[PDB]
Amino acid sequence: GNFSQACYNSAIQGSVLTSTCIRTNGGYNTSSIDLNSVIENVDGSLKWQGSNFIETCRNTQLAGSSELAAECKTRAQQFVSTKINLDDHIAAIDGTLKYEL
Amino acid sequence: GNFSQACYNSAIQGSVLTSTCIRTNGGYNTSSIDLNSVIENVDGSLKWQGSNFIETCRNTQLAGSSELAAECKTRAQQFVSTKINLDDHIAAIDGTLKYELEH
Lengths: 101, 103
Ligand SMILES: OC[C@H]1O[C@H](O[C@H]2[C@@H](O)[C@H](O)[C@@H](CO)O[C@@H]2O)[C@@H](O)[C@@H](O)[C@@H]1O
Ligand SMILES: OC[C@H]1O[C@H](O[C@H]2[C@@H](O)[C@H](O)[C@@H](CO)O[C@H]2O)[C@@H](O)[C@@H](O)[C@@H]1O
Prior knowledge:
The structure holds 2 chains of a larger assembly. By secondary structure, the first copy, chain A, is mainly beta. Chain A has one domain (about 1-100): Roll (HIV-inactivating Protein, Cyanovirin-n). Chain A is built from one helix and ten strands; from the N terminus they run αββββββββββ. Chain A has one helix at about 5; strands at about 5-15, 15-20, 30-35, 40, 45-50, 55-65, 65-75, 80-85, 90-95, 95-100. A three-stranded antiparallel beta sheet of chain A has the order 1-2-3. In chain A, strands 6-7-8 form a three-stranded antiparallel beta sheet, with no helix packed on it. In chain A, a hairpin with a 3-residue loop joins β6 and β7. The interface between A and B is medium-sized, with 15 and 18 residues. The complex binds a molecule of 2 linked components (MAN-MAN) (2 copies). A molecule of 2 linked components (MAN-MAN) binds near residues 50 and 77 of chain B.
């Protein structure tokens, strides 16, 4: 993971991470990834190894360089604040954001 | 954005846009993008900078080349007609649909 060391000017909008990331040729690329493919809302907490968190979460934000923050619904349908470190699994590969396991 | 300038046979089904786009060096690729990731319903109006419009909108359609049209609930729970131009932020990047920023 660790895209945040390869990238800058990062932003969160909805479930899409955008970032500007370094390229081996000296340039850079503006990249984007839909995090909803790889993050699940499990009982109010953001977790890896699933999907579709955006259906049951609101108010997504980037905190610092790599933390996704949101408010998500528990199974009993109430809201809690939650966060996940995107650096865990989001990398930059020659300027392009990618999920890595 | 401006995908519609490089793309063909676009379609919307639920929250998903699918299109067939000219690749940078020739030929075509087909890709999809889930618009639910980047479009919110604010009081009956489709807007960028949020997500999950599909929870409170229905009957989504493609109008012309690039407009998402749906019926979305206002806060008062009245369905109203709304549209958003997907060319605002959806690009064709070497034949693949991608959300892009404002720079
Ligand atoms: O309903 C879509 C939802 O399904 C799964 O989430 C389950 C649970 O973890 C949630 O707390 C509640 C919130 O209402 O919904 C579920 O029952 C996950 O796939 C989740 O990502 C998704 O949004
Ligand atoms: O309930 C999910 C819904 O939340 C937001 O919408 C707000 C409001 O703008 C909308 O008119 C009504 C419709 O009932 O729901 C409100 O509380 C927004 O994030 C939207 O995208 C989402 O569907």
